[PDB]
């Protein structure tokens, strides 16, 4: 048994506590929303899966592809505390909450331990122009200019071509990168990947 937890719901309903919608936020505040308010289900765009599916359509991020190009940002849709037609039960009763939420030390051993023990985390790293060209292998930043932080999902580690890496999921769809996943250098706090990691534990019954 498994749930796709709604990005729509957290994007649109957290409010200023999480930052500014489609113009950026605070992932530690996002894990504290879930612990306080909870998060309902909701799928991928047009999926009609869950309470609140994601309403911003896909596009090509920096790749060629069939979809429309991505625009800067857009309009954060709004918080509707109701599910879609056809979904049952009610929004309130589709909430899932977290027991708790925490920072994980800037220590690859600590971060290997959290994942290992408890499953994937959220981190964030600085993106530089050379990133966007990521097709495969282990990512190491050589050139480019700085473009801000990118919050990701880190789901493992390994060694490739002698390079210790982190295995990360991006949100740029399946056609960017390594099928939308990537590897970035481990153990050096490369591009800040080890400094901004947060997680928490589900609340059970």
């Amino acid at each position: 048994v498994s749930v796709e937890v709604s990005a729509e719901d957290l994007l649109t309903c957290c409010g200023s506590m999480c930052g500014d919608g489609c113009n950026g936020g605070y992932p530690a505040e996002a894990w504290n929303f879930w612990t306080r308010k909870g998060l309902v289900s909701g799928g991928l765009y047009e999926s009609h899966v869950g309470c609140r599916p994601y309403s911003i359509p896909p596009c090509e991020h920096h790749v060629n592809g069939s979809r429309p190009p991505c625009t800067g940002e857009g309009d954060t849709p709004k918080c509707s505390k109701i599910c879609e037609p056809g979904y049952s039960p009610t929004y309130k009763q589709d909430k899932h909450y977290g027991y708790n939420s925490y920072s994980v030390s800037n220590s690859e051993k600590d971060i290997m331990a959290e994942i290992y023990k408890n499953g994937p985390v959220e981190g964030a790293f600085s993106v530089y122009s050379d990133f966007l060209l990521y097709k495969s292998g282990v990512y190491q930043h050589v050139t480019g200019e700085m473009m801000g932080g990118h919050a990701i999902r880190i789901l493992g580690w390994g060694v490739e071509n002698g390079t210790p890496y982190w295995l990360v999921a991006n949100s740029w769809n399946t056609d960017w990168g390594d099928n939308g996943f990537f590897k970035i250098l481990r153990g050096q706090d490369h591009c800040g990947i080890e400094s901004e990691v947060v997680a928490g534990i589900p609340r059970t019954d």
């Binding site: 894990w31 940002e73 994937p120 964030a124 999902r153």
Partner: protein
């Protein structure tokens, strides 16, 4: 700890761990990192 780890392996009963989403043309990545890890952990920790 092992020298390599892949959550997709360890927990192949939790489909979400292998799912890649789309943030579209919106700087929503903060929410994405969060809900995707949260979806994982709901199944990993599920009695």
């Amino acid at each position: 700890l092992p020298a390599s780890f892949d959550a997709r392996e360890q927990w192949p009963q939790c489909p979400t761990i292998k799912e890649i989403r789309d943030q579209g043309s919106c700087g929503s990545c903060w929410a994405f990192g969060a809900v995707e890890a949260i979806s994982d952990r709901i199944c990993i920790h599920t009695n």
